[PDB]
DNA sequence: ATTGTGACGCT
DNA sequence: AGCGTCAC
């Protein structure tokens with residue numbers, strides 16, 4: 062009724078860089094632009110592992126987590142850029158620095174939460190109020206939304222359809238009310254057009270975006286029309302959108318929890334969740350998950366956009382698969398040193414840029430044949446940015462896993478050093 | 487031999 | 498604290 066809150070209080074956007082690592086390499090190397098091309102890590106085992114794919118290459122079936130030799134079977138003219146290698150491992154610095162370029166531009170418009178190297182949430186509520194009082198009541202022109210899709214429209218040529226749906230949306234709009242959620246979302250979309258234009262002008266990079274009333278819907282919306290487009294998901298669009306939406310497509314339901322929702326309740330689509338009471342969902346999935354599911358299948362989610370532009374952790378990882386697994390003490394020490402030297406470099410740069418110091422060192426390892434992705438995770442004190450000290454401390458922390466009598470067994474298939482617990486400096 | 491990250495929850 | 502989940 063009148064007291065049923067509808068989750069329409071905020072305007073939230075999710076901005077995701079289109080095939081980001083590919084775009085970084087295409088900016089640097091113009092011969093790669095507007096071509097089927099991918100970014101690969103390493104090169105010896107089956108041509109290297111593909112970690113990013115241009116849309117031209119995706120059209121041939123090339124995907125992430127495919128070996129380059131196999132991708133070339135699907136796409137013989139595929140062009141490749143290789144991740145930089147330093148100290149014997151992939152080094153992602155070029156892409157982190159490109160990400161900072163983009164995040165700093167986004168921060169001019171609004172508060173952002175860095176969700177990953179190429180994705181950020183945007184809290185647009187106050188920016189929209191400012192822009193609405195700036196409008197002082199005139200309507201919003203289609204010309205202000207040149208790359209926006211309105212999900213669910215038109216109802217009742219891809220670009221022609223986009224424009225039909227946008228016209229239907231704008232003709233319906235009630236610009237009289239500075240508190241209409243649909244109007245607020247529309248102004249949000251105008252601002253995100255401007256943000257995306259600024260990113261492309263000032264970096265060369267293109268991105269897609271979603272605009273809705275919360276983070277989950279904004280991320281879902283972002284996925285609906287890619288690349289280089291943005292999508293508005295209104296509250297009213299949720300029943301139809303969710304009526305055929307697989308549960309696994311909603312952020313956080315792509316794993317075991319979503320699988321159990323499907324199996325326990327005997328449903329397939331998000332919208333089917335509305336039939337259950339909050340207490341029923343809590344009985345199957347716990348108090349927190351159940352309340353979250355009850356609201357989310359109605360389009361309602363409360364998770365705030367956190368004011369956080371910088372990562373909370375600075376980590377360095379390397380897998381040693383198959384016969385490259387580490388089998389001697391010297392090997393383990395040398396790779397701990399390699400990881401620690403990259404970590405020291407990134408930490409010293411982080412301290413200069415961002416006025417903070419990490420205080421905890423996490424050391425994690427995998428042992429051969431262990432079913433888990435991480436076998437062991439132990440922490441120690443991080444007191445100075447010294448690679449030799451950090452590597453000696455990581456070894457001191459993990460050495461009691463060695464069961465032998467200069468040899469290391471069982472061989473180690475992953476090493477991981479992470480700097481955490483930052484404090485202002 | 488589907489890597490190298492990074493965020494968050496549980497107990 | 499250490500382990501597990503989730504999403505790229």
Ligand SMILES: Nc1ncnc2c1ncn2[C@H]1C[C@H](O)[C@@H](COP(=O)(O)OP(=O)(O)OP(=O)(O)O)O1
Nearest residue numbers: 077078079080081082083112113114178179489505
């Ligand atoms: N599993 C992974 N391993 C390594 N790097 C990854 C992985 N997933 C994503 N990345 C990196 C490379 C991507 O360019 C970047 C952004 O990831 P993501 O947003 O899913 O895809 P994308 O930006 O390449 O394409 P899209 O246009 O679909 O967003 O992060």
Ligand SMILES: [Mg+2]
Nearest residue numbers: 077078079080
């Ligand atoms: Mg992306």
Ligand SMILES: [Mg+2]
Nearest residue numbers: 077177179180
């Ligand atoms: Mg992304």
